[PDB]
Design a protein around this ligand. Structure first.
Ligand code: HEM
Length: 347
């Protein structure tokens, strides 16, 4: 049914299958050293595979991204025990910067590296902690990342589809179906991830580190390119300070293609702004207009079925505090949906 997922999943699998540093058996030893808080051992283990002669000239994106993944687990690890990886590992910084250049991504590990680009097998999956809860968190992202990428494609396609077009409602219904995966992810997370374990054992691995004279954030699901999708859909012309700063903060961590999508739509009304103008130009009693707007409201419904439960998920973990950004974004989503619902009012 969600047949657009396959191609995105296949691109992720290419990186997951790559191990140019032949680091698999070495990275698997990291959880034990983390448990032992063995900083010298962690550095020693990294130096067993860290390139010292520059990157192999034959590497492409796949190899460079795979190398960053495997070095990357040592970065959040070292910071977890209170150390800047660049300061305690001679020659590491130049490698990170070279890998950043090769991939057009930050000079550390991102959500992509630790989830969809990380192999799934027990004898291959890289992990900070080796904990089941960490594996469950990775799975929760794997459930929806490829679907979300399809959804970004669909949103961009829907942007050029007139509300007057016969496809509008059908495309919106298809977008809704892919976005349902985000809901599935939060249901999964609620079921399988212990809030105590997340907060006490996993969260400390996700601190920022300093590379190239600036701070780079840790992997988190916050880096999923959902914010790019919603920039196009409803948010591009939002003057809300917290929201704009949120998007600009996470922009460097998403794939270059989605950074390009973001830029393309920043100088234009968002999809719903255009659709609502169209509804007003035709008249909101027109059944085809109403069909389109109703379909659009369902997209907002599914976005809220992710976002509201996610806030609860986040609150439960931090009860063991969540940033204001979450509730603020939730409210903005409600406001956007309300604009659609207002057009559908029959009085
Ligand atoms: C117990 C598990 C989780 C916790 C504790 C958690 C916590 C948070 C927090 C605190 C934020 C605000 C930004 C930050 O400080 O990093 C955030 C944002 C975000 N998270 Fe989660 N999260 C969890 C699971 C998930 C899952 C499973 C997904 C999707 C697969 C997800 C998707 C997102 C997204 C897309 C944002 C950006 C804000 C938004 O769209 O509303 N999170 N998360």
């Amino acid at each position: 049914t969600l047949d657009r997922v396959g191609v995105f999943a296949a691109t992720h699998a290419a990186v997951a299958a790559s191990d140019p540093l032949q680091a698999r058996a070495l990275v698997l030893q990291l959880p034990g050293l983390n448990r032992n808080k063995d900083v010298p051992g962690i550095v020693g283990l990294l130096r067993e595979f860290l390139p010292v002669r520059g990157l192999p000239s034959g590497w492409g994106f796949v190899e460079a991204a795979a190398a960053m993944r495997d070095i990357g687990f040592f970065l959040g690890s070292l910071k977890r025990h209170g150390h800047e990886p660049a300061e305690v590992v001679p020659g590491l910084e130049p490698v990170l910067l070279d890998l950043a250049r090769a991939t057009n991504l930050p000079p550390r590990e991102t959500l992509l590296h630790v989830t969809v680009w990380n192999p799934t097998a027990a004898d291959a999956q890289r992990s900070y902690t080796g904990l089941p809860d960490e594996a469950h968190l990775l799975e929760s992202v794997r459930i929806s990342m490829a679907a979300l990428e399809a959804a970004i494609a669909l949103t961009v396609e829907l942007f050029d589809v007139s509300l007057r077009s016969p496809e509008f409602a059908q495309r919106s219904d298809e977008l809704e179906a892919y976005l349902q995966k985000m809901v599935e992810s939060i249901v999964y997370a609620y079921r399988f991830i212990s809030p105590q374990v997340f907060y006490d054992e996993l969260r400390p691995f996700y601190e920022p580190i300093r590379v190239g004279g600036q701070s780079y954030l840790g992997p988190g699901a916050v880096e999923m390119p959902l914010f790019v999708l919603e920039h196009v859909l409803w948010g591009s012309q939002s003057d809300d300070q917290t929201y704009r700063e949120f998007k600009e903060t996470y922009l460097p961590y998403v794939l270059p293609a989605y950074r390009a999508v973001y830029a393309r739509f920043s100088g234009e009304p968002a999809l719903i702004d255009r659709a609502l103008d169209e509804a007003r130009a035709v008249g909101t009693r027109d059944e085809h207009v109403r069909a389109g707007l109703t379909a659009l409201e369902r997209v907002f419904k599914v976005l809220l079925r992710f976002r509201a439960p996610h806030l609860k998920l986040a609150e439960r973990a931090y009860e063991v505090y969540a940033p204001s950004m979450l509730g603020e974004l939730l409210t903005l989503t409600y406001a956007a949906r309300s604009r659609v619902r207002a057009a559908l009012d029959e009085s």
